[PDB]
Design an enzyme around this catalytic site. Sequence first.
Site, PDB file in Angstrom:
ATOM      1  CE1 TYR A  26       3.382  -6.128  -4.668  1.00 50.74           C
ATOM      2  CE2 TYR A  26       1.047  -6.049  -5.312  1.00 50.74           C
ATOM      3  CZ  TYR A  26       2.099  -6.687  -4.674  1.00 50.74           C
ATOM      4  OH  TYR A  26       1.852  -7.873  -4.025  1.00 50.74           O
TER       5      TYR A  26
ATOM      6  CD  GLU B 148       7.293  -7.681  -0.755  1.00 51.00           C
ATOM      7  OE1 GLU B 148       6.825  -7.403   0.369  1.00 51.00           O
ATOM      8  OE2 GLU B 148       6.650  -7.505  -1.826  1.00 51.00           O
TER       9      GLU B 148
ATOM     10  NE  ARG C 284       5.388 -15.718  -3.607  1.00 51.11           N
ATOM     11  CZ  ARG C 284       5.348 -14.527  -3.006  1.00 51.11           C
ATOM     12  NH1 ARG C 284       5.349 -14.412  -1.680  1.00 51.11           N
ATOM     13  NH2 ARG C 284       5.298 -13.436  -3.746  1.00 51.11           N
TER      14      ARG C 284
HETATM   15  O1  LIG Z   1       0.691  -5.178   0.346  1.00 49.18           O
HETATM   16  C1  LIG Z   1       0.771  -6.000  -0.835  1.00 49.18           C
HETATM   17  C2  LIG Z   1       1.723  -7.191  -0.638  1.00 49.18           C
HETATM   18  C3  LIG Z   1       3.177  -6.787  -0.941  1.00 49.18           C
HETATM   19  N1  LIG Z   1       4.070  -7.939  -0.773  1.00 49.18           N
HETATM   20  C4  LIG Z   1       4.016  -8.765   0.430  1.00 49.18           C
HETATM   21  C5  LIG Z   1       2.576  -9.070   0.867  1.00 49.18           C
HETATM   22  O2  LIG Z   1       2.578  -9.532   2.220  1.00 49.18           O
HETATM   23  C6  LIG Z   1       1.627  -7.863   0.748  1.00 49.18           C
HETATM   24  O3  LIG Z   1       0.278  -8.264   1.043  1.00 49.18           O
END
Ligand SMILES: OC[C@H]1CNC[C@@H](O)[C@@H]1O
Length: 483
Positions: A323, A184, A94
């Site tokens: 996460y 996001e 991705r």
């Molecule tokens: O900080 C962790 C990651 C979270 N999601 C988008 C990414 O740009 C980022 O590195």
Amino acid sequence: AAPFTYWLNPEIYDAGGLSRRAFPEGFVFGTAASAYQVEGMAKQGGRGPSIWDAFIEKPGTIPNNATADVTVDEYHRYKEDVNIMKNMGFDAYRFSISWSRIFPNGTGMVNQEGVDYYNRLIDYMVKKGIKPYANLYHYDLPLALHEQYLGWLSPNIVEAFADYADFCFQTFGDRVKDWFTFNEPRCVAALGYDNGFHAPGRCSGCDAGGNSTTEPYLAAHHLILSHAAAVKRYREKYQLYQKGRIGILLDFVWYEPFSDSNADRAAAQRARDFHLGWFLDPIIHGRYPYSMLEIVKDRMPTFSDEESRMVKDSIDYVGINHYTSFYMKDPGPWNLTPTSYQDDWHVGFAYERNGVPIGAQANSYWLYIVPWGINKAVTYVKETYGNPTMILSENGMDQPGNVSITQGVHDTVRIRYYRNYITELKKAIDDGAKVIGYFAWSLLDNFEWRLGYTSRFGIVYVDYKTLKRYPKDSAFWFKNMLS
Ligand SMILES: OC[C@H]1CNC[C@@H](O)[C@@H]1O
């Protein structure tokens, strides 16, 4: 590197019972990155400036005044990187397409050199048998559109985005069969417009101006409409002929009630509504979450009946970037003077219970290691949104930037993280969740936005002096698990 670099970590061979057989038939394992974090060639190859290019220019924004002008330079070393993914046994990659590498101004004149780059990357991925998953937007709005009409805050952005998406579908859709509009959008809206932590750096206090009470909600509304408009182009013009799928990537922290009380439970739910429901309620139900409408009221825009129908069911799958987890408390009586989007949640955070931390922390201030949270998060999506088709689209953790090659490659904390989270994910799937793919963030140590190079998320160590790649023990753990 020092000889200890080449010690064989026995953790590599401990798969914790995980294998491709433990997962559904055709389940995709990949890694994820973004254009700005890995490409380099920020001010070269015809690429127009983005809001991050401007944001980074202000001194003190990025530690040691680092930039992503070169970063890990995947623009030139894409073959090596794809070769690593293949060698480690991954099925897919991705990546994101830089809007301003394709349209320097955001609209109009196509940068052919930029198009040629994406064509090279995709052709080689295909040649190597790596499935391309293409994200259209990952924090990198063309600066021109922000200069013209404040970017995401203007309804003008909607068709600008659709046109850009439309072009990507017709150019790359013969081989890209998996698309995402946004990575996001919650972060785009909140970090961009609530606390000004990310570009364009707007908020109530902020140097660049802004209003934390209204701008996050306006940004979000236009991101949802932009998504819907892009998906309409795809469905009506391309999908039947290209036979691909389209979705969106939503970040989802798991919020656990601090106690079984009704107030704490309702607090946890309210955080879910404001974090995930903000976007997924519109997409699945056609409307914003109830708590948001009641708290935010007139400070949130409304969909017309026509917009509501465009937005509803505008995904073929949902990407859940997951996460971490926190405990959630009722904060007590709410102060109802508008302060910010974050304040509108009216929740208290907790990181420990009975003297026990929810989990150990990674390098990043927000990243707590709580494997059970992935199970709860995915189960929640299954039960709340009609068991949608899901991709677990980002998962990973960081070490500090200030480690050597020698110690950096022995990332046994990261092996543990993946073994445990993937295990918890497997249970959710075994219990009925339609997860069709899992993507690790990230293949390489890269430019980590405001943290710059002080954070290492990769399963591959990058020496920033030489740009040499050194696979970490976690890379080999995947290679073993996946074979
Ligand atoms: O900080 C962790 C990651 C979270 N999601 C988008 C990414 O740009 C980022 O590195």
